[PDB]
Paper text:
The binding of RBD to the receptor hACE2 is an essential step for virus to entry cell, thus we first explored if the binding of six [name]-[name]-2 variant (including Alpha, Beta, Gamma, Mink-Y453F, Mink-[name] and Mink-N501T) RBDs to hACE2 were changed in comparison with wild-type (WT) [name]-[name]-2 (the first strain of [name]-[name]-2 which was isolated from a clinical patient on Jan 6, 2020, GISAID: EPI_ISL_402119) RBD. Given that residues at positions 417, 453, 486, and 501 are involved in the interactions between the RBD and human [name] (hACE2), it is important to understand the detailed binding of these novel variant RBDs to hACE2. To further elucidate the molecular mechanism underlying the binding of these [name]-[name]-2 variant RBDs to hACE2, we prepared for RBD-hACE2 complexes and obtained five crystal structures, namely Alpha RBD-hACE2, Beta RBD-hACE2, Gamma RBD-hACE2, Mink-Y453F RBD-hACE2, and Mink-[name] RBD-hACE2 at a resolution of 2.9 Å, 2.6 Å, 2.8 Å, 2.4 Å, and 2.7 Å, respectively. Each complex structure was comprised of one copy of the RBD-hACE2 molecule in one asymmetric unit.
Besides, both [name] and N501T mutations have been found in [name]-[name]-2 isolates from minks, as well as humans, and these strains were designated as Mink-[name] and Mink-N501T in this study, respectively. In the Mink-[name] RBD-hACE2 structure, the mutation at [name] impairs the π-π stacking interaction formed by RBD F486 and hACE2 Y83, resulting in the decreased interaction between Mink-[name] RBD and hACE2. While Mink-[name] RBD bound to fewer hACE2-expressing cells with a 1.65% positivity rate. We also predicted the structure of miACE2 and compared it with both Mink-[name] RBD-hACE2 and WT RBD-hACE2 structures. Thus, [name] mutation may be helpful for the interaction of [name]-[name]-2 RBD with miACE2.
Residue numbers in the entry:
A (entry chain B): 333 to 527
B (entry chain A): 19 to 614
């Protein structure tokens, strides 16, 4: 009766920046998924492929928990076949995604009077992300044709921008903590069942 | 990557950077305006200075993308708006001289004082001192003393500064490839490169003058009726054929004729609809007033206020020692933060103002999804036009009866309707010749058509001919009477009050037709009409992203400013005035003056 360490993921003190989204591999434990979906503490709980309704009657080889912070209007981008700054440059879900996306408003924790600038996102990139790709580079983005020489200037921008999370922002601009559960199925042990 | 692609990426960085820097400055400005302290003044300046410095830097960087190589119009609009040099096309010395001139004229206006003869310590400022005289006094000499002293003491200080201000403003405008500073102001209506919706700067002069010609008959009869009533009150001071003396108009300039209502009211025995007592009888507070305004916009299909609005706004006077600037304002801070600042009292006036101010919020919320630089009204007259129509509907007896403030046993008779329309005309119609004549004078000064040694000669020639108003004391060229009004000495364009007035009745007529209103336009209430709300919202969400000609067409079906809805609104008064003036002289001679 090893219980899956979901508390470390959902109840973490600080979440990761979405450009550097955090992944926690969950293995060899018992997951009570129904506690999450029947807790009524999340504003978004949408599953694709699998069903939130009592599908903790299944076994999976590995479960991955991706967590990060984005603003409320960007939670829509954490879904298959979505475009936008988050989906293209920071965190991209595949078209055939099998898993769940969970998000809740964290204005009480991730906002601060005067502004919380701890959380960043990638604003520019040469191309779009492959599904489940992570780019933590800090290379100055070359928008023109003149080399940047590693500093920002004309047509040269440092690629990461900061959210300014203030408690008085609108709901669309408030911070939201996101957890993305991936359910993997290999021709393999199937170690995470979780009655 | 092409020049256009670089501009898109550049604007991408600007929007995200500006959003937060603007928010920081709005937040600091809010904290001072609700809580007046020395520390808040400094924080307001520091955040404001950083935002201004950011804009100056980004304006220079924007100028390195030439508009000639951009085809996407929505990119060109944002690039052009940021690129505008403003005063930064002049040398630093000239720029500095102009900024010193602007601050001095502003300081003279807001600290200028007048002291009564024989007591050099009994002095009055314009606000509230001189304004109280000009809005409330019936004594001819007290009004004349206030009118002349303001112009003779404060106006004369402004004359040399205003002369130098014109020279530097024209240099700035010509360096920006405008004809003059007036042509620069008219650029707010310019539209290029949109087939069927373009509008030139010179077309505004023609359209203002063309629509003003159609206003003259209504104004002439409004002028004639007012002159007759004042002649009954002041038989020795008013000629039956002459202009109205400039100090007998209800405020310092005759900008509005509102305060002439008591001496000109047609039927002085029928009282106004004043719904204030019913509000107090039902124990209304400020939150109720704004809840009712919210209910109004929801009834036409617009969204309710955000949660932050109720939590972060200041809807009442904070009171004890935390002082606040009580002028009603609607705040768009960005980042979904919408607030209203208002020291609300339980009165009918503040009830209507809340609907007006919440109208701005509805406009601000609707174009929030637009890029930062396009988050504004289609032109300088749209936002205030949107606010005004909300109070038109909210004030009608039909609306006040449906919310339980006006008795069901109150029915409209035609005498109260004439009283109301006359009161409306004194404010709305009376200001139109004043506004057009004032802006025409500034246009001609900037154009070079009025030499310095004839500034005040032409100013009062145009007051007599166009406005039908005559100065009570001759003024030589040491005076600068136009600068004695806030907007002239504080460098604000003025035609916006003319165009907005025509826009608001175009909006209201279109919305009321969508609301299937039957009867005279002035009795219309757009409440409960989602068709009207949808028609208005289609323009609101545009912001500045489309030509103002297109945005107007979304509401009213026409591409240009049209005076007919304004005349439709006032038609019952117009027919009543024409019958009243049958045994009066209509029009004015310009050669009569009170100083003979
Ligand atoms: C987080 O903490 C709360 C309160 O201690 C608890 O109810 C909840 O189950 C925790 N989250 C997880 C994923 O266990
Ligand atoms: C007013 O501002 C001061 C600082 O200038 C601050 O300490 C105080 O809490 C403020 N009061 C209110 C009611 O906001
Ligand atoms: C202009 O650019 C924006 C974003 O770069 C794009 O969405 C829009 O369709 C473009 N308009 C035209 C006419 O190309
Ligand atoms: C506004 O209306 C929505 C329904 O569209 C509702 O969920 C929300 O609670 C309302 N908010 C307020 C402040 O009335
Ligand atoms: Zn307003």
């Amino acid at each position: 009766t090893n219980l899956c360490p979901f508390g470390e993921v959902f109840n973490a003190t600080r979440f990761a920046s979405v450009y550097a989204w955090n992944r926690k591999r969950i293995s060899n434990c018992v997951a009570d998924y129904s506690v999450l979906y029947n807790s009524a503490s999340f504003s978004t709980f949408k599953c694709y492929g699998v069903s939130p309704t009592k599908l903790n009657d299944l076994c999976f080889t590995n479960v991955y928990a991706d967590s990060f912070v984005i603003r409320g209007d960007e939670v829509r981008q954490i879904a298959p076949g979505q475009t936008g700054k988050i989906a293209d440059y920071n965190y991209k879900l595949p078209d055939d995604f099998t898993g769940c996306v969970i998000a809740w408003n964290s204005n009480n924790l991730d906002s601060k009077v005067g502004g919380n600038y701890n959380y960043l996102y990638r604003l520019f990139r040469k191309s779009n992300l492959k599904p489940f790709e992570r780019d933590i580079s800090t290379e100055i983005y070359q928008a023109g044709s003149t080399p940047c020489n590693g500093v920002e200037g004309l047509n040269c921008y440092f690629p990461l921008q900061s959210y300014g999370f203030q408690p008085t922002n609108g709901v669309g601009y408030q911070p939201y903590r996101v957890v993305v559960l991936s359910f993997e199925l290999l021709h393999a042990p199937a170690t995470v069942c979780g009655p | 990557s092409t020049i256009e692609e670089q501009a898109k990426t550049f604007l991408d960085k600007f929007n995200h950077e500006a959003e937060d820097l603007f928010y920081q400055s709005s937040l600091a400005s809010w904290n001072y305006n609700t809580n007046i302290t020395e520390e808040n003044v400094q924080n307001m300046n520091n955040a404001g200075d950083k935002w201004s410095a950011f804009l100056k830097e980004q304006s220079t960087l924007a100028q390195m993308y030439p508009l000639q190589e951009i085809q996407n119009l929505t990119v060109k609009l944002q690039l052009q708006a940021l690129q505008q040099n403003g005063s930064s096309v002049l040398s630093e010395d000239k720029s500095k001289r102009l900024n010193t001139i602007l601050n001095t004229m502003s300081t003279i206006y807001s600290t200028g004082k007048v002291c009564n003869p024989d007591n050099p310590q009994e002095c009055l400022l314009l606000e509230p001192g001189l304004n109280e005289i000009m809005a409330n006094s019936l004594d001819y000499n007290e009004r004349l003393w206030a009118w002349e002293s303001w112009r003779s003491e404060v106006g004369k200080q402004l004359r040399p500064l205003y002369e130098e201000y014109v020279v530097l403003k024209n240099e700035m405008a010509r360096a920006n490839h405008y004809e003059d500073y007036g042509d620069y102001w008219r650029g707010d209506y310019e539209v290029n490169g949109v087939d069927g919706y373009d509008y030139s700067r010179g077309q505004l002069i023609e359209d203002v003058e063309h629509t003003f010609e159609e206003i003259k008959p209504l104004y002439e009869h409004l002028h004639a009726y007012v002159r007759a009533k004042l002649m009954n009150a002041y038989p020795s001071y008013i000629s039956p054929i002459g202009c109205l003396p400039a100090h007998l108009l209800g405020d310092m300039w005759g900008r509005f004729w509102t305060n002439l209502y008591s001496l000109t009211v047609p039927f002085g025995q029928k009282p106004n609809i004043d719904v204030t007592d019913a509000m107090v009888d039902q124990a209304w507070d400020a939150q109720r007033i704004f809840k009712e305004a919210e209910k109004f916009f929801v009834s036409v299909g617009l969204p309710n206020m955000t949660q932050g609005f109720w939590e972060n706004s200041m809807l009442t006077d904070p009171g004890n020692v935390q002082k606040a600037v009580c002028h009603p304002t609607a705040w768009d801070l960005g980042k979904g933060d919408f607030r209203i600042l208002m020291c609300t009292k339980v009165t009918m006036d503040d009830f209507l103002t809340a609907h007006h101010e919440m109208g701005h919020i509805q406009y601000d919320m609707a174009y929030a999804a637009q890029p930062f630089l396009l988050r504004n009204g289609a032109n300088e007259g749209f936002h205030e036009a949107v606010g005004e129509i909300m109070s038109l509907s909210a004030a009608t007896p039909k609306h006040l009866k449906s919310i339980g403030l006006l008795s069901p046993d109150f029915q409209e008779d035609n005498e109260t309707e004439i009283n109301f329309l006359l009161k409306q005309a004194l404010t709305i119609v009376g200001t139109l010749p004043f506004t057009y004549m004032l802006e025409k004078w500034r246009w001609m000064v900037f154009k070079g058509e009025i030499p310095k040694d004839q500034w005040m000669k032409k100013w009062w020639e145009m007051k007599r001919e166009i406005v039908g108003v005559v100065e009570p004391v001759p003024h030589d060229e040491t005076y600068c009477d136009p600068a004695s009004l806030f907007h002239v000495s504080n460098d604000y364009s003025f035609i916006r009050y003319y165009t907005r007035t025509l826009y608001q009745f175009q909006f209201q007529e279109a919305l009321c037709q969508a609301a299937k209103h039957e009867g005279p336009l002035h009795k219309c209430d757009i409440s409960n009409s989602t068709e009207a709300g949808q028609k208005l919202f289609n323009m609101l969400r545009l912001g500045k992203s489309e030509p103002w000609t297109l945005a107007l067409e979304n509401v009213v079906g026409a591409k240009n400013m049209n005076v007919r809805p304004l005349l439709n609104y006032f038609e019952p008064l117009f027919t009543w005035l024409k019958d009243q003036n049958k045994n009066s002289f209509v029009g004015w001679s310009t050669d009569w003056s009170p100083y003979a």
